[PDB]
Paper text:
NCXs facilitate the exchange of three Na+ for one Ca2+ in an electrogenic manner, primarily responsible for extruding Ca2+ from the cytoplasm. The eukaryotic NCX consists of a transmembrane (TM) domain with 10 TM helices and a large intracellular regulatory domain between TMs 5 and 6. We previously determined the human cardiac NCX1 structure in an inward-facing inactivated state in which XIP and the β-hairpin between TMs 1 and 2 form a TM-associated four-stranded β-hub and mediate a tight packing between the TM and cytosolic domains, resulting in the formation of a stable inactivation assembly that blocks the TM movement required for ion exchange function.
The density of the IP3 head group from the bound PIP2 diC8 is well defined in the local-refined EM map focused on the TM domain. The lipid is attached to the cytosolic sides of TMs 4 and 5 with its head group positioned at the C-terminal end of TM5. Four positively charged residues, including K164 and R167 from the N-terminus of TM4 and R220 and K225 from the C-terminus of TM5, are positioned in the vicinity of the PIP2 head group and likely participate in the electrostatic interactions with the head group. The first change occurs at the C-terminus of TM5, which ends at R220 and is connected to the two-stranded XIP β-sheet (β3 and β4) via a six-residue loop in the apo structure. When PIP2 binds, the TM5 helix extends by one helical turn. The second conformational change is the partial detachment of the CBD2 domain from XIP upon PIP2 binding, resulting in a downward swing of cytosolic CBD domains (CBD1 and CBD2) as a rigid body. Thus, the PIP2-induced TM5 movement, particularly the reorientation of Y226, abolishes some local interactions between CBD2 and XIP and also pushes CBD2 away from XIP, causing the partial detachment of CBD2.
Author numbering: 17 to 247, 370 to 467, 482 to 644, 652 to 698, 707 to 718, 737 to 935
Write the structure that this text describes.
Amino acid sequence: SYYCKKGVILPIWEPQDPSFGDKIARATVYFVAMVYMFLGVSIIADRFMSSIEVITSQEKEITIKKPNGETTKTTVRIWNETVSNLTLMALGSSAPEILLSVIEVCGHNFTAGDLGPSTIVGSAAFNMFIIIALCVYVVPDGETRKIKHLRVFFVTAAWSIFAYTWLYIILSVISPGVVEVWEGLLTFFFFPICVVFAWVADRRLLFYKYVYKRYRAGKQRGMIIEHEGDRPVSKIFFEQGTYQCLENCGTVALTIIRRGGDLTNTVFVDFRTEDGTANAGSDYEFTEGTVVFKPGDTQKEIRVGIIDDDIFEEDENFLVHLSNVKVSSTLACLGSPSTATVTIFDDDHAGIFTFEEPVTHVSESIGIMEVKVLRTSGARGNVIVPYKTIEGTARGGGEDFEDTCGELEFQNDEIVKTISVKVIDDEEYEKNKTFFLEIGEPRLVEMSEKKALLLNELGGFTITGKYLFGQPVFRKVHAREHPILSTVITIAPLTSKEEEERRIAEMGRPILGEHTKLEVIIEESYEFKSTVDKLIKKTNSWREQFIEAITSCFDYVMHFLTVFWKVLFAFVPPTEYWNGWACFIVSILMIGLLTAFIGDLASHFGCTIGLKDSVTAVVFVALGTSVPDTFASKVAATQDQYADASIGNVTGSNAVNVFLGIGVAWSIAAIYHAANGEQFKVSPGTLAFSVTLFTIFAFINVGVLLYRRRPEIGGELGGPRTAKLLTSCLFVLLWLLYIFFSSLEAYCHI
Ligand SMILES: CCCCCCCC(=O)OC[C@H](COP(=O)(O)O[C@@H]1[C@H](O)[C@H](O)[C@@H](OP(=O)(O)O)[C@H](OP(=O)(O)O)[C@H]1O)OC(=O)CCCCCCC
Ligand SMILES: [Ca+2]
Ligand SMILES: [Ca+2]
Ligand SMILES: [Ca+2]
Ligand SMILES: [Ca+2]
Ligand SMILES: [Ca+2]
């Protein structure tokens, strides 16, 4: 219409419908005042967001070292991006729309206007489309961003869309045309469910999975934001005369060469093995054979079996004798190296256990660390190595490292085993705390029966089904373990040759190596050190704020253009006072009153031109009051390793807008009206179409965002220039279509 109801603050222009031309003279003043008024919100909401950053920040103390002997004391704070803190920043960034809704309801005798809910729905569509398109385009070329937690995005996106479809439910589906107390109070109570869900999610996400932390410089002077980030007779003789074969080869391949004379001859030669150091039948199979040289053949290959057992022995040798050379159908004479001496190298040492290095320097960012324990010089048997951690300078009670005391078990032919130690991340700027880790005397456990007799073990033996080298593997039973006591079997004038065998076999038990005590020196985290060094390199309070308020030509124009708001908001107390709360109380009022002014302007620029409140809520006020959100979303998209916070801010703001603003405003109106005895009325016809259109387009937006999860695209946000431009153009087109159709239906064109 063309009659204007009185504002909360501003009174009506006394001439009404004056002329076709005078409407311009009033409307340009109203619109210019609104546009210049939005800058005040854009600045004071930034300061309010800074204050609410200060409120939820952990304090840290830094002892800065410099070439002077004295070390300076500096305080830096560490605001951590978490789902709970992003919701508070989103609510803080989303405060103007909530205060606009509350003031719009309360000012006009508790009667709902179009402006309040309509600017919330318009800001919802703006937040979902235009800000996400901007976040798509601001990621630099050659870089992409991916949502680390897709399931968090799902739950949050579903909750965000569910808020608006619930708005449609209470306006049209359930109890149409009215808003009862049980509807508005429930819609308000939905928000604590969201914040408890955020708190539960933050605790579960941090505890369940360790997150690598990266520190970047904050917006303020002394804040360090931390975020999760990514981390010529014929002669017969041996070819060699000396052979070297391991015990576990199974067969040693001897070779016999016939040379000279004539190839076309038939001769017989008999090879038999003879006892040397290695005994026949126990270490080498007694192989006696006869071979014949076919005519035209020079070499003949023979094999001798090597018996493998688990007992440690020294190097041994056995001989091979050739004899009885005969000529079939003198002519054949034996070569000079007739006899061969085969040597067996036993390799049944149980091991030598060493730490890799005597000292390692580590930071707390490693979290769980692995320390190798090398087992050299042998592999046979199964060996337990006890290990423990000793507190040095670093006191250990789970505050600096977890006390681990265990027993490593080295299986057969297992060389490297890892000790897992937990280091608590204190994220201190500089510390040099040390703790030791020591391995005790190792004991062999499982063995064959013959080795058990040779080592003269007396303990209880449980027979295991595993077969090694054709013999059963018995295991010594620890006193803690409780067998049936019927399964266990005790194996339990020596010839003075068997004593020597026992002495040689006794050298096979596991021993310790050179390094038994590893000193781990905990050094400072590299990310925090680099961040603080960069911050120092890049580098009372009332006075400083005032002179910084009053300070290339484009910068001069912008500064002069906003000098009124900067001077006025320099009267806001600095964020150091009252732990930040001094700003928090004073800034929000400076929003509220200011926000009230916007409403009156939006109530009058509509009536002067003849523009409905729904349209001027959708296109003008929604764009003006959502500009504090887009800066946070853009910075979070640009700086983060993973762009979870950028989309999360949009989604949290879109949920918080409804659940706070429409919640408290409509609940207060419903309580007042129901107590007074008159039912509270809201016409759902205009808002129902807009909320349905927003839901339909939000599903498309979510689908298009999920389409970029393919490895061809690269990530959720950014990537190749073509995909960036296509996605941004699609989102801007979607927002344009939304506002065009909503504005057309508001004028009943449909
Ligand atoms: C509306 C009610 C909702 C109730 C459920 C509420 C669900 C909810 O909000 O959970 C928050 C949290 C989010 O974690 P989310 O799963 O989003 O993140 C995954 C995980 O936490 C790690 O970040 C990644 O593994 P890793 O550590 O890097 O190896 C993993 O793989 P990648 O993609 O990064 O490679 C990530 O996808 O936990 C769950 O979702 C697990 C639910 C398990 C049960 C799910 C079924 C209930
Ligand atoms: Ca209802
Ligand atoms: Ca032997
Ligand atoms: Ca042997
Ligand atoms: Ca062997
Ligand atoms: Ca052996």
